[model samples]
Target: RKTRKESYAIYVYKVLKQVHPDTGISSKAMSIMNSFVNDVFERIAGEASRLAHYNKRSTITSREIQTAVRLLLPGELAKHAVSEGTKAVTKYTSA
Candidate 1:
């Protein structure tokens, strides 16, 4: 059985893979891509949990997600996309 974090990470990866805008990649390559995305997302989630106290939020927000992703994946191409995605989600939730 997967841990909660692992389960959440895989869920995120599946969604990303299914909705990915990029084409030309094989399913096997996409799975590898999903793994990389999930790893980065887990790292971001872990970092956000650590920083949660500073923000005084009971739960993590997209701002936290963006910060965590930026800190943990500065060099990754997906970092900006993740940040933008989080921003969009936050915006929709806040509306």
Candidate 2:
């Protein structure tokens, strides 16, 4: 099985580049951002698991992820994150 042991550090850099193309991040800042990213991801995954357990379902679906994001994020941030997430998934779903 291909376990997902990849770090999001590179993806974090990509996201940073999207906003500040010419700027560079310090090593410490990069480390902090990497930890922050994974921490948020783990929190959301934990929330999603709780949601599934509460609903008497063992499977975590897209709905759980969406609801987890809404529960974890602030109103505006959740909305924006959901929009971005939805857009990305939709694009990949195209045949």
Q: Give the root-mean-square deviation of each candidate in angstroms.
A: 5.9, 4.1
C-alpha-based local distance difference test score of model 2? 0.89
Q: How do the predictions measure up, each by TM-score?
A: 0.53, 0.85
User: Candidate 2 — worst ten consecutive residues by lDDT sum?
Assistant: 4-13
* Number of colliding residue pairs in each model: 0, 0
Task: Give each model's whole-structure lDDT.
Answer: 0.71, 0.89
User: Model 1 over residues 1-95: C-alpha lDDT tens digits?
Assistant: 86654334455556656898453555576677777767776788899987897868789877787677677765765566686787789799899
Model 1, which residues run further than 4 Å from truth?
Answer: 1-23, 54-57, 75-83, 90-95
lDDT of 1: 0.71
TM-score of 2: 0.85
Q: 4-64, model 2: which lDDT tens digit per residue?
A: 8666678777987999888888879988888898899899999999999999998998789
